[PDB]
Amino acid sequence: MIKVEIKPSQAQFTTRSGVSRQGKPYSLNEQLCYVDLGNEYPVLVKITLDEGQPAYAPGLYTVHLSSFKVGQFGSLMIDRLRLVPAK
Amino acid sequence: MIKVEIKPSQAQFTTRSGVSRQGKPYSLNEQLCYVDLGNEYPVLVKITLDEGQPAYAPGLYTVHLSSFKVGQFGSLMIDRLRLVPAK
């Protein structure tokens, strides 16, 4: 269904850091990817990885169901784009 | 990929109305559906239909690509859940 591609140039993540107003230090890993939305070319999208999972290796992926949740207004939302290998 | 179901009880939409601060009257059609997120049972989700399209008839659907857009923070978002028939 959605085609996602991690190029050889996108195999690394970068890390954002900080602290909650409640004192707690956070760390977020982000990686770029290409998502085919059916335009001329794929579009560049930023993924925030889950705690403890590595960067996705280059290759083709599709979107795992756990990426979605029902939002506070009763409509479907993406929580975090969670990927699985293509075949 | 995502399995969406319109039950016989969900074949109708309701209409919300109003006016923009800029003067313009709007009308929004909403319908309910069931989305399998892989829990025990499907979850109830509210759809806002596009201008001029009717209520989806009861049956099985999946999610059309045009439901997604890149949001203002560079991550993928759902714009409006747009459906297509299952086979």
Curated annotation (Swiss-Prot), chains A, B:
- What are the alphabetically sorted keywords of the record? DNA replication, DNA-binding
One Pfam family recorded for the sequence = Phage_DNA_bind
According to the lineage, what is the superkingdom?
A: Viruses
Annotated GO biological processes are: DNA replication; rolling circle single-stranded viral DNA replication
Asked if DNA-binding is a keyword of the record, the answer is yes
Task: Check the record and name the InterPro entries matching this protein.
Answer: NA-bd_OB-fold (IPR012340), Phage_M13_G5P_DNA-bd (IPR003512)
* The protein's assembly and partners: Homodimer.
- The name on file for this protein is DNA-Binding protein G5P
Which organism's genome codes for this protein? Enterobacteria phage f1 (Bacteriophage f1)
Query: Which taxonomic lineage does the organism of this UniProt entry have?
Result: Viruses, Monodnaviria, Loebvirae, Hofneiviricota, Faserviricetes
